[PDB]
């Protein structure tokens, strides 16, 4: 389902 | 020269996905004591990037490691696709997401009158989902009576077991459930559960990608992460 961003 | 990944791939987007799952393992008392507990997780990465690259992992105590065998704060040329960059498991500093509480009181020799609370132990902002807590009952149980405010239970008399079935909940609540068990004249409460964070702490620093023979740096790749944590062995003892 949800990836979130890695920075 | 690598025998895990061909020489000559190119994707148009390189993408990178980055699952950590963990799986949370604890006994606890009945009166909230740590009995045991610890993490079992993984960290599987789908990797879409072009060429030959060299990357870099990195990311509280870890107690064992287990990388794959093109790893070498870790360098390594991911293969073309799915495939797991290391296994772990920690100890200590463990989050443990619910809070069983069980609370059973005797009536005679016919009844039994139970309560037991559920107290998510998470940032609000957060749900946890698929919550599934069995009480079980006697070998001698007669018939069941249960209600509870929030989802669904039923008496799986044949597993001779109570499920109460709760679709989300966010963390910093608490919900209960209490029955009447007559019975003819004691293992543990256990919990499913999921949770959209690493229970051990676990999050990912930097993942770097090194092409030094084709035309992208790290400013290139889009980058994804995903954090899931569920239950494995989660019981409370009375």
């Known amino acids: 389902y949800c990836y979130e961003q890695l920075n | 020269q690598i025998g895990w990944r061909r020489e000559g791939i190119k994707y148009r987007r390189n993408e990178l996905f980055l699952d950590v799952l963990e799986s949370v393992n604890l006994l606890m008392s009945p009166q909230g004591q740590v009995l045991s507990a610890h993490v079992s997780g993984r960290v599987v990465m789908k990797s879409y990037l072009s060429g030959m690259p060299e990357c870099k992992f990195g990311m509280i105590a870890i107690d064992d ?36 509480i069980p609370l059973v009181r005797e009536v005679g020799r016919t009844k039994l009158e139970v309560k037991v609370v559920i107290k998510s132990n998470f940032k609000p902002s957060l749900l946890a989902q698929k919550i599934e807590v069995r009480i079980p009952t006697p070998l001698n149980t007669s018939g069941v009576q249960v209600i509870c ?39 543990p409460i256990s919990m499913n559960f999921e949770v959209p964070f690493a229970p051990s702490g676990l ?22 992460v995903r954090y899931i944590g569920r239950s494995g062995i989660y019981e409370t003892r009375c």
């Open chain 2, 65 to 100: 490691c287990t990388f794959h065998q093109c790893v070498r704060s870790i360098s390594f040329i991911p293969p073309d696709g799915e495939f797991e960059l290391m296994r772990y498991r920690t100890t200590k500093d463990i989050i443990l997401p619910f809070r069983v």
């Open chain 2, 149 to 187: 405010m929030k989802g669904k239970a039923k008496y799986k008399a044949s597993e001779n077991a109570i499920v109460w079935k709760i679709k989300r909940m966010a963390g910093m609540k608490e919900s209960q459930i209490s029955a009447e068990i007559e019975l003819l004249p004691r293992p």
């Open chain 2, 203 to 224: 999050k990912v620093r930097y993942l770097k990608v090194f092409e030094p023979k084709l035309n992208y740096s790290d400013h290139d790749v889009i980058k994804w």
